Amino acid sequence: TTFLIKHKASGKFLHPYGGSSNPANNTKLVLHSDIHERMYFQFDVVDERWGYIKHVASGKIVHPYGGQANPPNETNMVLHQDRHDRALFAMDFFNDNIMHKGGKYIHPKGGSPNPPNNTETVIHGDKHAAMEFIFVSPKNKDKRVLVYA
Amino acid sequence: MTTFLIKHKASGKFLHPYGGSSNPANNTKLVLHSDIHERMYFQFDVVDERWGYIKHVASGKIVHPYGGQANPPNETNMVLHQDRHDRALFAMDFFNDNIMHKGGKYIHPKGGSPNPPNNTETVIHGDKHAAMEFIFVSPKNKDKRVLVYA
Numbered sequence: 001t002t003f004l005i006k007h008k009a010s011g012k013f014l015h016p017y018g019g020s021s022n023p024a025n026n027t028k029l030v031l032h033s034d035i036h037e038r039m040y041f042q043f044d045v046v047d048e049r050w051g052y053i054k055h056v057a058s059g060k061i062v063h064p065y066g067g068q069a070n071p072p073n074e075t076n077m078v079l080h081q082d083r084h085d086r087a088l089f090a091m092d093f094f095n096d097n098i099m100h101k102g103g104k105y106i107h108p109k110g111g112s113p114n115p116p117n118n119t120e121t122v123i124h125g126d127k128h129a130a131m132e133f134i135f136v137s138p139k140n141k142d143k144r145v146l147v148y149a
Numbered sequence: 150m151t152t153f154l155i156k157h158k159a160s161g162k163f164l165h166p167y168g169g170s171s172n173p174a175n176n177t178k179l180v181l182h183s184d185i186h187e188r189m190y191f192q193f194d195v196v197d198e199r200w201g202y203i204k205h206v207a208s209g210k211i212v213h214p215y216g217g218q219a220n221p222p223n224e225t226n227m228v229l230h231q232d233r234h235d236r237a238l239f240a241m242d243f244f245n246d247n248i249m250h251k252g253g254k255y256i257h258p259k260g261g262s263p264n265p266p267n268n269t270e271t272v273i274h275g276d277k278h279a280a281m282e283f284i285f286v287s288p289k290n291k292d293k294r295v296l297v298y299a
């Protein structure tokens with residue numbers, strides 16, 4: 001299932017910075033209001049809830065920068081081609097968050113409910129309304145879709 | 150598939166049709182029991198994103214609140230029934246470890262015991278606590294969580 005990763009508070013979406021069909025390794029993942037095929041994602045299940053968040057256009061997946069199992073707060077989120085257990089996430093569609101294997105979450109850097117375009121995303125352990133994400137149809141940005149298959 | 154056991158987290162007991170039949174009559178109660186066998190296997194049939202039917206594999210019947218209300222009151226018995234409709238929609242919350250009916254209440258052991266005896270009935274109730282938690286595990290390994298969504 002293909003989906004958009006929608007920041008719940010702002011309605012902006014996760015994008016590779018620059019919007020490329022083939023972002024280089026270590027391109028930062030930002031929030032941006034645009035919708036297009038280079039911000040579509042899929043989720044590749046590895047072990048029950050845990051899997052890879054895949055950028056559809058490039059096949060690269062989401063990593064904490066440097067590939068930590070326990071990335072510190074403020075570690076940047078990036079795309080990278082590699083596959084390993086430090087790039088595992090769970091797409092929590094009940095609590096509306098994205099949790100890294102180490103137990104922290106994807107946040108907008110700074111924690112704004114309304115981050116401007118091109119705000120970087122980071123790992124942070126805090127839970128609040130401004131780190132919530134929902135997973136929606138590329139044809140209807142208000143319709144949640146099931147990311148697990 | 151995916152086929153799974155519905156395991157009451159606090160006690161390790163499993164959801165069964167009372168009696169363990171391969172073809173339970175409509176309105177057979179769903180109870181907790183320690184036994185493992187093919188007549189307590191379930192599958193989840195997705196209808197709308199998180200919402201779907203909890204299907205008894207042996208019979209094809211599905212989990213309902215008795216009476217099929219949109220908003221069943223607390224203590225309404227859980228049963229199996231052949232019918233499909235929107236009052237038999239549940240979500241399998243494998244993050245918070247519970248099973249929520251479309252009306253917003255959860256599946257509980259009747260009376261709230263965390264160590265209920267065999268044949269304890271299950272019911273709808275709105276409360277959230279450790280004794281209403283469930284996990285979804287492999288029929289071949291009751292300690293291994295499996296993904297129920299597909």
Ligand SMILES: C=CCO[C@@H]1O[C@H](CO)[C@@H](O[C@@H]2O[C@H](CO)[C@H](O[C@H]3O[C@H](CO)[C@H](O)[C@H](O)[C@H]3O)[C@H](O)[C@H]2O)[C@H](O)[C@H]1O
Nearest residue numbers: 015016017018019020030031032034035036038039117118
């Ligand atoms: C000023 C009016 C005309 O120019 C507009 O200026 C914008 C600057 O405010 C430009 O937007 C920028 O366009 C870049 C690509 O040329 C980048 O946009 C890409 O990357 C984004 C994610 O970082 C999104 O995916 C976006 O869809 C994608 O095109 C840059 O991020 C963006 O600010 C642009 O020249 C034009 O709209």
Ligand SMILES: C=CCO[C@@H]1O[C@H](CO)[C@@H](O[C@@H]2O[C@H](CO)[C@H](O[C@H]3O[C@H](CO)[C@H](O)[C@H](O)[C@H]3O)[C@H](O)[C@H]2O)[C@H](O)[C@H]1O
Nearest residue numbers: 025026063064065066067068078079080082083084086087
């Ligand atoms: C001759 C120089 C040796 O380095 C080579 O080139 C790259 C340096 O640009 C190396 O890649 C870098 O390796 C780092 C680990 O030492 C980082 O890679 C880690 O983090 C990534 C996510 O940011 C991935 O998770 C990756 O799997 C993980 O190892 C850095 O990001 C990466 O560019 C390369 O190892 C080497 O061949």
Ligand SMILES: C=CCO[C@@H]1O[C@H](CO)[C@@H](O[C@@H]2O[C@H](CO)[C@H](O[C@H]3O[C@H](CO)[C@H](O)[C@H](O)[C@H]3O)[C@H](O)[C@H]2O)[C@H](O)[C@H]1O
Nearest residue numbers: 165166167168169170180181182184185186188189267268
């Ligand atoms: C010290 C001896 C006391 O135990 C006696 O033997 C039975 C165990 O086989 C006790 O259990 C009851 O067995 C019933 C069928 O004979 C029912 O079991 C069936 O349904 C269960 C779900 O409700 C399970 O699916 C089980 O696998 C299935 O066989 C009854 O539920 C069970 O309590 C009996 O109470 C006792 O006399």
Ligand SMILES: OC[C@H]1O[C@H](O[C@@H]2[C@H](O)[C@@H](O)[C@H](O)O[C@@H]2CO)[C@H](O)[C@@H](O)[C@H]1O
Nearest residue numbers: 074107108109110111112122124126128
């Ligand atoms: O970056 C995500 C976090 O943003 C806010 O924390 C700020 C600031 O970003 C951080 O550098 C600082 O150390 O703490 C600040 C506390 O105001 C949010 O408050 C956090 O919950 C994260 O979302």
Ligand SMILES: OC[C@H]1O[C@H](O[C@@H]2[C@H](O)[C@@H](O)[C@H](O)O[C@@H]2CO)[C@H](O)[C@@H](O)[C@H]1O
Nearest residue numbers: 176213214215216217218228230232236
């Ligand atoms: O119990 C689940 C079913 O509830 C309702 O039917 C009840 C009862 O089960 C049935 O035997 C009786 O004859 O009718 C009642 C409804 O008035 C639902 O209408 C069924 O679809 C099942 O949900």
